[PDB]
Design a protein around this ligand. Sequence first.
Ligand SMILES: N[C@H](CCC(=O)N[C@@H](CS)C(=O)NCC(=O)O)C(=O)O
Ligand SMILES: N[C@H](CCC(=O)N[C@@H](CS)C(=O)NCC(=O)O)C(=O)O
Ligand SMILES: N[C@H](CCC(=O)N[C@@H](CS)C(=O)NCC(=O)O)C(=O)O
Lengths: 121, 121, 121
Amino acid sequence: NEVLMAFTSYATIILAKMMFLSSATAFQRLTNKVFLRTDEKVERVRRAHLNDLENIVPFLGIGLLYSLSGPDLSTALIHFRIFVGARIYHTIAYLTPLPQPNRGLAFFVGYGVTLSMAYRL
Amino acid sequence: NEVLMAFTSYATIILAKMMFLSSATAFQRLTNKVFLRTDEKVERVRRAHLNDLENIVPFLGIGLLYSLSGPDLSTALIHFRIFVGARIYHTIAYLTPLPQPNRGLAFFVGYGVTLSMAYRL
Amino acid sequence: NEVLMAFTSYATIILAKMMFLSSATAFQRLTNKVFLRTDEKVERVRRAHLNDLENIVPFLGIGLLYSLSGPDLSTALIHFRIFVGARIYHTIAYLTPLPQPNRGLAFFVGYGVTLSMAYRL
Ligand SMILES: N[C@H](CCC(=O)N[C@@H](CS)C(=O)NCC(=O)O)C(=O)O
Ligand SMILES: N[C@H](CCC(=O)N[C@@H](CS)C(=O)NCC(=O)O)C(=O)O
Ligand SMILES: N[C@H](CCC(=O)N[C@@H](CS)C(=O)NCC(=O)O)C(=O)O
């Protein structure tokens, strides 16, 4: 299954993340300041383009850094279905808000799945 | 060719990106503010170190996330020569400016090559 | 050894980096400004969550981008023990300070190990 698994995953990582950077592209502020919106459009955009992102930078980096020596398989459907599993839902969880209800979910995964994928090997 | 291909590629990604972070290192502002330049040096540096970067974070992350199950080869010289192909030229395209003439080019690649490298498999 | 090597490495990259993002999580400023601390807590946090990070984004990205065609082995214990080797010590080096004593160490590695891992192949 390291076959299918790596897959469904990644597509969400250029999609989730990337379906999102461009939709964050300048539906421009009435600009003057280069020489209500700005912050609270940026405060969505930057703050949104930030968290799609990093939630991957380790998460996904590690996401292979491990499978690079491709596991058994009975676990791996889980730890990888669970793996993206959260982080998907999670990405959907956090971009919407900004504060608490995600930092939590972002912790059990990146720290865990990684200590695991370290250890297990 | 997944041989040669991954290669020429990556080198540009620590070079392009990284030949660039250090050349962005502090040819210092006449500093006072830590306790014309600042913004418009940062507005080059941060704004330049930002876009070398992400244009990879997915792009390249995915760039393997796919080849990890190494394709045929008759396509792959293209989709990977075209792959870096743009993004090279592209990186050269965007860092220079800041606004429109690149966001475009950055879209057909990261979104495409990725839906593809998702699909094809 | 591309076996063991990739390994010890990565774990430090979700740990180093990630053991660190969450410990950077809001031991909140006495907040008012959303509508001494802020900057100098952020100036630690953002400025700390930034440099764990990128010191990997290429470094580690490339870190595999190469081993993806897994080297000999007599060199590889070095170039990879030396590889994380610095960057570990280095990450420990830079987050603590902010200015000079690291940018240096960050250069010989990311630029080198990468031109190398380009070339050698
Ligand atoms: N520090 C607050 C808010 C920062 C914030 O909630 N932004 C999120 C993104 S939407 C962020 O930068 N998080 C990245 C991180 O957790 O390091 C402010 O400056 O007003
Ligand atoms: N938002 C504008 C300019 C921002 C800008 O053009 N910077 C580019 C980098 S050179 C950027 O942050 N782009 C990253 C992105 O597209 O998310 C400002 O604050 O004056
Ligand atoms: N530019 C200075 C300080 C910036 C700084 O030292 N922050 C470090 C992180 S702790 C940084 O952003 N480095 C990232 C980089 O080198 O591009 C300021 O605005 O006061």
